[PDB]
């Protein structure tokens, strides 16, 4: 029978800093065992200081991203050029997603940006709309690999303060963009070591009040 | 999941855990399972994440509209039947949600309704809902008494979630407490099981099936 779905691999990761947030994703696109492209971006700038990626079935991810940008276009039109805050973009997406609850967009999406107060923000969605704001989150194939790492290296879980008989948690400080990028790169190299779908390249979108900056690093191509 | 709400002298207690799972994968431990509808109405969630978040945020809207339309705050009975009738319209499509609509109104007093995606809507004083419900009931039922003090109530609801968080693989993260009174819901914190378990063990002297 016709199977309306497929899996194009890839993995994406988002991290929110104090006055920035990043949304990185690998650049490989596959099908079964073949590499479709070594460079096919899946993290995009949607205007209004909002980056989004919908990773999973590319057709769906693409459709989703398209419908959202457009939702941003019409938000401007219908509401006199008002800027779509990230919280609002999020809720909008929930609806985009949940509209297809009975023939889902087989994707795990994330958007990053700055909140109304200027602090970094990341939001992630279940293929049918569940969402929440978070400090960091990875999605896609190597999600299971990368996520634990971030809980540890970003949120300092299980790390306590030396010589306290494990009764005092490590001070929850906030990483700098530089450190975040180091983590992003490691999380990705690691993921490429162990996942056959992850590799080829890593594209990170950094978001600050100064707009959106793009950084690109090569990954293993095997 | 693991959620409870029970009625008593000082009001209603609503305690839920905060874990989200994708099968055996722990998707998150920072999910709010209680949606604050209006200053006197709480809705708890269990089942599909989206289904609950979505239809309960919606419930919130329909509640507001009623305010605008009738000038009076929506009753818990009516608030609940909306969700219920909604859900019943979708019966047979796969919605998955088990929830409790707790609230206080001058007319009904403290009230709790259980509404699930099968369309069962019921009124009662104690309901535990979710994969960890049995675990919660176990603890809840055995120490529950009507003449409980507000403080003891908080602790009990709290403890019951703790219980389920321990035994039920699918529950955990942290407990969120809520007290519903004559004057509205009062949030009583977010407690990380990571630390709550240990404190409770030492102070209470239970969970002896563990060493530490």
């Amino acid at each position: 029978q016709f199977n309306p779905y497929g899996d194009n691999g890839g993995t994406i990761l988002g991290i929110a800093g104090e006055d920035f947030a990043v949304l990185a994703g690998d650049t490989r696109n596959i099908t079964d065992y073949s590499i479709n492209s070594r460079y096919e971006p899946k993290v995009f700038d949607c205007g209004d200081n909002i980056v989004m990626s919908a990773n999973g079935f590319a057709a769906d991810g693409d459709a989703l991203v398209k419908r959202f940008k457009n939702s941003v276009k019409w938000y401007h039109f219908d509401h006199n050029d008002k800027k779509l805050s990230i919280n609002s973009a999020a809720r909008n997406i929930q609806h985009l997603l949940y509209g297809k609850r009975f023939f889902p967009y087989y994707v795990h999406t994330i958007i990053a940006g700055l909140d109304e107060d200027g602090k970094g923000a990341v939001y992630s969605f279940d293929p049918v709309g569940s969402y929440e704001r978070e400090q960091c989150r990875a999605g896609g194939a190597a999600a299971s690999l990368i996520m634990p790492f971030l809980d540890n290296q970003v949120n300092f879980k299980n790390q306590y303060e030396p010589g306290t008989n494990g009764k005092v948690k490590k001070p929850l400080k906030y990483l700098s963009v530089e450190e975040v990028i180091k983590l992003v790169r490691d999380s990705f190299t690691s993921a490429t070591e162990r996942h056959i779908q992850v590799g080829d390249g890593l594209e990170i979108l950094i978001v600050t009040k100064d707009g959106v900056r793009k950084e690109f690093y090569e990954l293993k191509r095997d | 999941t693991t959620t409870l709400a029970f009625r008593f002298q000082g009001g209603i207690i609503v305690a839920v855990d905060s874990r989200a799972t994708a099968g055996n994968w722990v998707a998150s431990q920072t999910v709010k399972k209680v949606i604050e509808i209006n200053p006197f109405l709480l809705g708890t969630m269990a089942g599909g994440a989206a289904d609950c978040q979505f239809w309960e945020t919606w419930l919130g809207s329909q509640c507001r509209l009623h305010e605008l339309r009738e000038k009076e705050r929506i009753s818990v009975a009516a608030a609940s039947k909306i969700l219920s009738n909604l859900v019943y319209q979708y019966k047979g499509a796969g919605l998955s949600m088990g929830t409790m609509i707790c609230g206080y109104t001058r007319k009904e007093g403290p009230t709790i309704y259980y509404v699930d995606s099968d369309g069962t809507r019921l009124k009662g004083d104690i309901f535990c809902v979710g994969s960890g419900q049995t675990f919660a009931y176990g603890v809840l039922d055995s120490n529950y008494k009507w003449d409980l003090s507000v403080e003891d109530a908080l602790y009990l609801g709290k403890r019951s979630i703790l219980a389920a968080a321990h035994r039920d693989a699918y529950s955990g993260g942290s407990v969120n407490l809520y007290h519903v009174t004559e004057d509205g819901w009062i949030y009583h914190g977010n407690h990380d099981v990571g630390e709550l378990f240990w404190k409770v063990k030492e102070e209470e002297g239970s969970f002896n099936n563990v060493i530490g």
């Binding site: 279940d126 | 994708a22 089942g47 994440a49």
Partner: peptide
């Protein structure tokens, strides 16, 4: 589909 996340669950609870």
């Amino acid at each position: 589909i996340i669950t609870x």
